[PDB]
Amino acid sequence: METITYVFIFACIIALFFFAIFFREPPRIT
Amino acid sequence: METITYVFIFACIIALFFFAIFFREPPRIT
Amino acid sequence: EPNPNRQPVELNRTSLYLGLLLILVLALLFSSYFFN
Amino acid sequence: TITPSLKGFFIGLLSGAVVLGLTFAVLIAISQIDKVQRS
Amino acid sequence: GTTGERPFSDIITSVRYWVIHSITIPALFIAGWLFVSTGLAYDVFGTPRPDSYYAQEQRSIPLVTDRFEAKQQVETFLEQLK
Amino acid sequence: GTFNFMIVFQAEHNILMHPFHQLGVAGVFGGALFCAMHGSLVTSSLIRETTETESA
Amino acid sequence: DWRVLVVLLPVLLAAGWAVRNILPYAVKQVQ
Amino acid sequence: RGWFDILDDWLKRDRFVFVGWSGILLFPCAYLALGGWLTGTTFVTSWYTHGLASSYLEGCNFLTVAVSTPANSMGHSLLLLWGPEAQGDFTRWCQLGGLWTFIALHGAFGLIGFMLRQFEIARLVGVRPYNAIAFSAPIAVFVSVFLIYPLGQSSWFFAPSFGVAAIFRFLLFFQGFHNWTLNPFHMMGVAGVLGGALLCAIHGATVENTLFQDGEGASTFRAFNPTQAEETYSMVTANRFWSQIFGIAFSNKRWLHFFMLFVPVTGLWMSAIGVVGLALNLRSYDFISQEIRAAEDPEFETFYTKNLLLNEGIRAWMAPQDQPHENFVFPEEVLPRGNAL
Amino acid sequence: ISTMAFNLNGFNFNHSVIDAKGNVINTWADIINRANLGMEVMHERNAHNFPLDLA
Amino acid sequence: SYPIFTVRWVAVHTLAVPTIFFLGAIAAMQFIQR
Amino acid sequence: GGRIPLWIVATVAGMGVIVIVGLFFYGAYAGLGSSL
Amino acid sequence: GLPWYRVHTVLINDPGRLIAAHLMHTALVAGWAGSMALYELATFDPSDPVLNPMWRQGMFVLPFMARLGVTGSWSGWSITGETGIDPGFWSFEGVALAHIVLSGLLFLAACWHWVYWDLELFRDPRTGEPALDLPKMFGIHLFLAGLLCFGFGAFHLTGLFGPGMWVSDPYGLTGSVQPVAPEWGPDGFNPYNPGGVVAHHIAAGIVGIIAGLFHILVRPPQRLYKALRMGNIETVLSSSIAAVFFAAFVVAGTMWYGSATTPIELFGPTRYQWDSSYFQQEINRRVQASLASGATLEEAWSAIPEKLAFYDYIGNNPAKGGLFRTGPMNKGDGIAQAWKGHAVFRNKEGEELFVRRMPAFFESFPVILTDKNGVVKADIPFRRAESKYSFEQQGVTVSFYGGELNGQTFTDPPTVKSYARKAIFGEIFEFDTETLNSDGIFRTSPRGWFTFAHAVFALLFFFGHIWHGARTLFRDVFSGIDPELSPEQVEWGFYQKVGDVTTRR
Amino acid sequence: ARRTWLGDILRPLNSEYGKVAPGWGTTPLMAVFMGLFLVFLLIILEIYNSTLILDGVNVSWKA
Amino acid sequence: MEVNQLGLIATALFVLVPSVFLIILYVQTESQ
Amino acid sequence: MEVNQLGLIATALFVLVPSVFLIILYVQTESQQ
Numbered sequence A, B: 001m002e003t004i005t006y007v008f009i010f011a012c013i014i015a016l017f018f019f020a021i022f023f024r025e026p027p028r029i030t
Numbered sequence C: 001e002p003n004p005n006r007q008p009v010e011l012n013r014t015s016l017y018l019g020l021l022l023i024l025v026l027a028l029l030f031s032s033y034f035f036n
Numbered sequence D: 001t002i003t004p005s006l007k008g009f010f011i012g013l014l015s016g017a018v019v020l021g022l023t024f025a026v027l028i029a030i031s032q033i034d035k036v037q038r039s
Numbered sequence E: 001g002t003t004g005e006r007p008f009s010d011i012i013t014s015v016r017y018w019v020i021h022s023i024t025i026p027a028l029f030i031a032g033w034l035f036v037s038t039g040l041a042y043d044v045f046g047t048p049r050p051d052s053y054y055a056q057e058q059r060s061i062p063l064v065t066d067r068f069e070a071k072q073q074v075e076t077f078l079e080q081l082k
Numbered sequence F: 001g002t003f004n005f006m007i008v009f010q011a012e013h014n015i016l017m018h019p020f021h022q023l024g025v026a027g028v029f030g031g032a033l034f035c036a037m038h039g040s041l042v043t044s045s046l047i048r049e050t051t052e053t054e055s056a
Numbered sequence G: 001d002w003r004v005l006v007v008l009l010p011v012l013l014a015a016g017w018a019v020r021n022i023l024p025y026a027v028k029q030v031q
Numbered sequence H: 001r002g003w004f005d006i007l008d009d010w011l012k013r014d015r016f017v018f019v020g021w022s023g024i025l026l027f028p029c030a031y032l033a034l035g036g037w038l039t040g041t042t043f044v045t046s047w048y049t050h051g052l053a054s055s056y057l058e059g060c061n062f063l064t065v066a067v068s069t070p071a072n073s074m075g076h077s078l079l080l081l082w083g084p085e086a087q088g089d090f091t092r093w094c095q096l097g098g099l100w101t102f103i104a105l106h107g108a109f110g111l112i113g114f115m116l117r118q119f120e121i122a123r124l125v126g127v128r129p130y131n132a133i134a135f136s137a138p139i140a141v142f143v144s145v146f147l148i149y150p151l152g153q154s155s156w157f158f159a160p161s162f163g164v165a166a167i168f169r170f171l172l173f174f175q176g177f178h179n180w181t182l183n184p185f186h187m188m189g190v191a192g193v194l195g196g197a198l199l200c201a202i203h204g205a206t207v208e209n210t211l212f213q214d215g216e217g218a219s220t221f222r223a224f225n226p227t228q229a230e231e232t233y234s235m236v237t238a239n240r241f242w243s244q245i246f247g248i249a250f251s252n253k254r255w256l257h258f259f260m261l262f263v264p265v266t267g268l269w270m271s272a273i274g275v276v277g278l279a280l281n282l283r284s285y286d287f288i289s290q291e292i293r294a295a296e297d298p299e300f301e302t303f304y305t306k307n308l309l310l311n312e313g314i315r316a317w318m319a320p321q322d323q324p325h326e327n328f329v330f331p332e333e334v335l336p337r338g339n340a341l
Numbered sequence I: 001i002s003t004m005a006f007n008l009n010g011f012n013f014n015h016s017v018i019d020a021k022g023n024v025i026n027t028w029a030d031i032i033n034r035a036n037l038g039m040e041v042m043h044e045r046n047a048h049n050f051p052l053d054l055a
Numbered sequence J: 001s002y003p004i005f006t007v008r009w010v011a012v013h014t015l016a017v018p019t020i021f022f023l024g025a026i027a028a029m030q031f032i033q034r
Numbered sequence K: 001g002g003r004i005p006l007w008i009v010a011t012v013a014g015m016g017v018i019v020i021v022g023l024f025f026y027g028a029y030a031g032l033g034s035s036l
Numbered sequence L: 001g002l003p004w005y006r007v008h009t010v011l012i013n014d015p016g017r018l019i020a021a022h023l024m025h026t027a028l029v030a031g032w033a034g035s036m037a038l039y040e041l042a043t044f045d046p047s048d049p050v051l052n053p054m055w056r057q058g059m060f061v062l063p064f065m066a067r068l069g070v071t072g073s074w075s076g077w078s079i080t081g082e083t084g085i086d087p088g089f090w091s092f093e094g095v096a097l098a099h100i101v102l103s104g105l106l107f108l109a110a111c112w113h114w115v116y117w118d119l120e121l122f123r124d125p126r127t128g129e130p131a132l133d134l135p136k137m138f139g140i141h142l143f144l145a146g147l148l149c150f151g152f153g154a155f156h157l158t159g160l161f162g163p164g165m166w167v168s169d170p171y172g173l174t175g176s177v178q179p180v181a182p183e184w185g186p187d188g189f190n191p192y193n194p195g196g197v198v199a200h201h202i203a204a205g206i207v208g209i210i211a212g213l214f215h216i217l218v219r220p221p222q223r224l225y226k227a228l229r230m231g232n233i234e235t236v237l238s239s240s241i242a243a244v245f246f247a248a249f250v251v252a253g254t255m256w257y258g259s260a261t262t263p264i265e266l267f268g269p270t271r272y273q274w275d276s277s278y279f280q281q282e283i284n285r286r287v288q289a290s291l292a293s294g295a296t297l298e299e300a301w302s303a304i305p306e307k308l309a310f311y312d313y314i315g316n317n318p319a320k321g322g323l324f325r326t327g328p329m330n331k332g333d334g335i336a337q338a339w340k341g342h343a344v345f346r347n348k349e350g351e352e353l354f355v356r357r358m359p360a361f362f363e364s365f366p367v368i369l370t371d372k373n374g375v376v377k378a379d380i381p382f383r384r385a386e387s388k389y390s391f392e393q394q395g396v397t398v399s400f401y402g403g404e405l406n407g408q409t410f411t412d413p414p415t416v417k418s419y420a421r422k423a424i425f426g427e428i429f430e431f432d433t434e435t436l437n438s439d440g441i442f443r444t445s446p447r448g449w450f451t452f453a454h455a456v457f458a459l460l461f462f463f464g465h466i467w468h469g470a471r472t473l474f475r476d477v478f479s480g481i482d483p484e485l486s487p488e489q490v491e492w493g494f495y496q497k498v499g500d501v502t503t504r505r
Numbered sequence M: 001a002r003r004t005w006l007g008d009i010l011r012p013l014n015s016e017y018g019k020v021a022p023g024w025g026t027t028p029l030m031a032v033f034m035g036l037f038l039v040f041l042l043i044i045l046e047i048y049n050s051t052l053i054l055d056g057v058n059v060s061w062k063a
Numbered sequence N: 001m002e003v004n005q006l007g008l009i010a011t012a013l014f015v016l017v018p019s020v021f022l023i024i025l026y027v028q029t030e031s032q
Numbered sequence O: 001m002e003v004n005q006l007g008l009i010a011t012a013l014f015v016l017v018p019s020v021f022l023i024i025l026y027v028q029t030e031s032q033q
């Protein structure tokens, strides 16, 4: 169970990486 | 742990009753 | 290129009370069996 | 090779066919006499 | 409204109705009575008469225990009452 | 404890064979039946007053 | 079978009697 | 104007008893389940399948007659009248249990017919088909109890038999072998049936006791015109009454009547699911933790342990006669019994 | 429930059908009775010292 | 000017006539002795 | 068509059903099923 | 705004975002299958396919991989007990990995189709509205299904170009993966004939190839198109759920009753093998043969293989469990270690007695010993004050033949009774209860959990069928009935035909 | 709408929205296949049920 | 009482996850 | 390994409770604009 927990959290961060890059709030000049 | 869980859930229901009565959406005659 | 099919979703307060009550009562019922 | 129950099988097969056949004959026959009317 | 059949209040108060059904109703009652008095209901449906549930000295029930030999099992129990 | 009570009542009184209890079941089965019925029939005959995206 | 005729006897009477008393009115339909 | 369209015209003529296309399924199958039950409770025995009398002809009364299930030894045979068991012999079909499958299968198709009829009539008249949808719950009960449950067991012998006291025996079998009262699916079903009776009664009483005065008569029934536009009772006064009595109250007439469909319909569905589990003996029979303590602590007693002692008495005292094909012989000395009784 | 409180109980059809010799021909009521007796002899298993459970 | 044989007619007799026959049968059963 | 009054057929039909069911209750004490 | 229970309806006129949602759903399912397999590999003990097979260990997808030919692990064990195989890529681990990878590609495909939803292929040339030609798509998809179905039966199952399928003897002792020839002719419809599965897929595949072609080329007739609302995608949802719950019942039935596609070495015994004493009968045949060839009792019972005895045990009957008794069968009665041997009970007079076996219906059952005829001869009494048949009074002994206890007799009544209490479960085994801290309570097998879950889902899906069925056929009044409906259409007599105004009067 | 290469290639396969054979078309032919299929599923059911026993078909694990 | 250890988390999540879902939908209905 | 069995609900709530609070606040921001 502890192995599953560690890998789950890791997996969740990688998925967060994907959304933060590709589905970020786009920066718009002024 | 199981006694705490049962009472916890019971206690959340009593609080829900309180909010559901005293903080309902008032029925308005519209 | 915005999608025309998007709609806002809603859950009124009454629906929240009903749903919360359902889930809590279901947990109170099934918890004894989860613990067994 | 035809076994007793395969004979049974066809019997009830022929039976149901007949029952359903008669039903729809009657119903088509009646429905052709007792026609609705439309102005 | 009405869908065109004759009202029931009209028929069961009609005389013609009671001419026909003064006979038909009792005739059917008599036929059912006879179905049982003749003993024809026992033989049609396989129902035991009060004297034919057991053999005179047996106390065990004639329970069918084979799916495909079952019709022949029931006939065997019935011959063993003679 | 409610089930304990029911089982022992049945032992001691054969409540299942009692017509007043049979009437209780007609009362509650029938109550639920007619509850579903009346709800389903009013709900079936709601006047169109809303679009397909809103709750009726 | 002698019994399958007594059980059926009164039923035919009923049906014949009902036929002989409604037979004219049922020919009026015929449409 | 083809023959199909002319047949459609006649099947949907407005007549005292509407037929429709659904009627071709409904009327034959309903009538035959009915007729078959009446025939079997009037004239047919359960002597060869159960060791039981079951008809008026044998001197049973309305409570004790049944069309009883077939012998365990038939398995899940369809028990066709022309099939290998009965070989076309009507009398011996009655004696082997043919009427049970006759009723159970015609009845299942009649139920399909009735729901199709609901869809059919609803479509013709112009109304939404929520009545059909609600009727899904009776169908789910009937299918899980009379077909699925026995199909997971050894044979049709353990389905319910069609009679009043036969169904009570079912009831009690389920207590003693399955502990069905302890099953949360059955509890949910109980809540939806009792709750639906509750709703039924409280809605009818509320409306009868917030009528407007719409006529001068003491009999208040004549002051309703079905074509009238106006609510016949006050939602506003009803809502105030219950808000102050009970703390909440409906404010939405449509939600209220949808809630009335939902409760009993959902309850039956839930109990259906539990019975599917019982097809498999997948019971909520025990609480392991209670058994582990009880077995080590002879002074630990609860209502759960008391009820299981009851279950054990039901099983031992009822098995030999209820399951005769097992030839259970239980000497007196093994029968579980408390003191004196 | 209120009249069974005064021990006016459900119909009792136990051994109500018998054959021409007087063998008991069980019905479904008798099968119910077999289950009732299993409840009776096991409920409150340490509580009865005498053979009838009269209240 | 009403029909006398209708669909309804078939329905009512489909139920009523077996009912009466069955009732005479059950009547006669009260006088069976064992 | 309509001559025999309704209240009379009700009474007669009603007494007729009383008799048939009365007989059934008689039979619960006589012959088969009486326990004797 | 949209109610919570209607959120996914924004997909109904958006075929690109529907493909996206469907891609995401497929990625979820492939990912679960790979996830599930990895959990099962991390917890599976391959060391004893006799007394600790997969179905005792709560393995659910392991038998689906095994059923079609995957049998070995990258660490070098096979589920058949063969050490040293080299499975190639297509090992349990490689199958799991492939599903993960596939899940991830499908995930990315689903983002593309979500972002690039407004594709020209989804809009009708005539009118510029999004439109899908569902009759033609059905033909396309049906043709594809037939080829796959044909190819799976013609190549994979035959072993023409593939591994074949799991096949076993009638008593589940020698299972393994084998090419299977098709069985045309009538035993092909026998559920226990594996040749029938091959033929089914060849023949069914050809039909679907042909029907697919028919459905690509012939338009539906107007009568059927209007009647079934074939320009509405909810009609497919409705009919598709119906076909799914049909499939869902069949697979529960065949899993519960047994078929050539649900072998006992992968999912465990069926309850009916216990009901009819199937394994007991075969064991007894083998013993009455050995004695005819001049063997002792010890030798004849010593030759019964443990695997076969283990099947004659009620703890492996899948109808002995409970809904909230979770985990593997080993968490109940323990990890089976050895056959203790076949117990033979005798009374003081030397006559042999047989313990009445527990039927599946009973959570508990008394210990009753009858002679060869069925006469009660010994029991373990409840009230002792008037007991006539107790083991003490009747001098009951137990002697073992085969297994751990071969050639031992016990005579002290307390030991004899504890072995009689286990004989009601059939053959008697040594169990390790310590390793999993097992609690003594029977659990069901994967065969039971599969059947329960699929029967429940089939029944719920029936409700989905009725729901979307009704919405397809009543779409016009789904938000309510016509606010200017006439009393003439619903009151009686006015129209000769219900709901058809042309018939007035 | 966005055009793409793959789109254009597939475009014919999704272009006959609404097109129907006139009248009743192949309906009678469909009904025949349905009736055949029901008969065939019936045979399969009854073999599994052991209501239909055929020579050489032993519906047992011993097949 | 020797209950199942995962019972605690199964119950906790059984409650938390659907409740949170309803709270999310409710709070964003209010702010529009 | 013989880990603390509550380490799991400790970890689950540690992730879940603060995450849900951020998600709630963000979704109700988006449906303001």
Ligand code: CLA
Pocket: L184, L185, L186, L189, L203, M036, M040, M043, M054
């Ligand atoms: C699902 C459809 C299907 C298909 C595609 C086939 C196809 C086949 N069967 Mg099977 N069959 C089926 C269903 C099917 N059968 C069913 C439900 C049964 C009842 C149990 C049988 C009973 C059956 C028998 C008894 C025999 C076959 C044989 C055969 C083969 C030769 C047919 C022939 O001319 O027989 C010639 C020989 C005969 C003794 C006459 C049998 C005639 C059978 C019943 C024809 C049935 C198939 C037919 C084409 C119907 C399908 C139409 C469909 C595509 C719409 C062929 C591979 C025969 C064979 O050689 O294999 C051993 C054979 O002996 N089949």
Ligand code: CLA
Pocket: D012, D013, D014, D015, D016, D017, D019, H024, H025, H026, H028, H029, H032, H078, H079, H080, H081, H082, H098, H101, H102, H103, H105, H106, H109, M031, M032, M034, M035, M036, M039
């Ligand atoms: C709505 C009508 C209806 C329905 C659904 C049923 C249904 C059933 N009956 Mg009941 N039955 C009915 C009316 C009906 N019956 C009537 C009116 C009577 C009194 C006469 C009976 C008397 C009766 C008895 C006595 C028994 C049944 C039995 C049965 C069962 C098995 C039937 C069977 O095997 O058929 C098999 C036959 C068919 C499926 C019909 C074949 C259909 C076609 C024609 C086959 C050929 C297709 C062809 C290739 C393509 C044609 C295309 C087209 C365009 C022409 C089933 C539950 C049995 C039962 O309940 O046993 C437990 C039984 O013993 N029925």
Ligand code: CLA
Pocket: H266, L039, L040, L043, L057, L058, L059, L060, L323, L324, L325, L326, L327, L328, L445, L446, L449, L450, L453, L454
């Ligand atoms: C097709 C479904 C399916 C089936 C048949 C199985 C079958 C199995 N699994 Mg698997 N599993 C599945 C899906 C499935 N799994 C999925 C999706 C997951 C991921 C969550 C897992 C994760 C998983 C793990 C982690 C483990 C298993 C294990 C097992 C075995 C023991 C199961 C057990 O104790 O259940 C117990 C079942 C229950 C307690 C039943 C739950 C049902 C309750 C009643 C909830 C429903 C109530 C509902 C909310 C009511 C709402 C009402 C409302 C609508 C009004 C068994 C062979 C175990 C094993 O042995 O591993 C080797 C094990 O450790 N499985």
Ligand code: CLA
Pocket: L004, L005, L006, L007, L008, L009, L237, L241, L460, L461, L463, L464, L465, L467, L468, L471
């Ligand atoms: C192929 C399967 C399938 C598909 C694609 C759909 C698709 C749809 N359904 Mg149908 N439905 C199905 C099966 C299906 N349904 C079944 C089996 C049932 C009976 C249980 C229903 C009963 C049903 C009703 C009563 C309604 C729909 C509605 C809808 C629409 C909106 C759904 C939505 O927004 O959910 C929103 C759902 C949520 C936000 C969460 C629901 C949480 C569920 C209860 C538990 C989660 C399950 C979990 C993730 C595990 C997966 C289960 C899986 C293994 C089986 C959409 C068109 C609605 C509609 O008509 O709109 C007009 C509607 O009112 N459906």
Ligand SMILES: CC1=C(/C=C/C(C)=C/C=C/C(C)=C/C=C/C=C(C)/C=C/C=C(C)/C=C/C2=C(C)CCCC2(C)C)C(C)(C)CCC1
Pocket: H031, H032, H034, H035, H036, H037, H038, H039, J014, J015, J018, J019, J020, J022, J023, K017, K021
């Ligand atoms: C099964 C079968 C069949 C069919 C059959 C039929 C169709 C039947 C019918 C039958 C019927 C159809 C019957 C009926 C009966 C009836 C009766 C038996 C009744 C009774 C009644 C009563 C007794 C009631 C009374 C009362 C009371 C109690 C109270 C109030 C008042 C009154 C009056 C209501 C056939 C041929 C196919 C063959 C196979 C098998």
Ligand SMILES: CC1=C(/C=C/C(C)=C/C=C/C(C)=C/C=C/C=C(C)/C=C/C=C(C)/C=C/C2=C(C)CCCC2(C)C)C(C)(C)CCC1
Pocket: L027, L028, L029, L030, L031, L032, L035, L100, L101, L102, L103, L104, L105, L107, L108
């Ligand atoms: C992206 C990508 C990637 C990666 C991937 C991944 C890593 C994946 C994973 C995935 C996964 C890993 C998934 C999984 C999923 C899962 C699921 C989907 C589950 C579900 C479940 C459920 C649904 C359940 C339910 C339930 C419960 C909870 C309780 C009891 C009852 C039931 C059973 C109902 C790669 C690199 C390859 C490639 C590139 C891209």
Ligand SMILES: CCCCCCCCCCCCCCCCCC(=O)O
Pocket: D004, D005, D007, D008, D011, D012, D015, D016, D017, D019, D020, H081, H082, H083, H087, H088, H089
């Ligand atoms: C080999 C066995 C010989 C059996 C021959 C005589 C039995 C035949 C009686 C059949 C009664 C007809 C009812 C079948 C029709 C019901 C099915 C349907 O109509 O849909």
Ligand SMILES: [Cl-]
Pocket: F004, F008, H306, I042, I043, I044, I045
């Ligand atoms: Cl008690």
Ligand SMILES: [Cl-]
Pocket: I047, I048, I049, I050
């Ligand atoms: Cl006492």
Ligand SMILES: [Fe+2]
Pocket: F038, F042, H203, H257
């Ligand atoms: Fe109302």
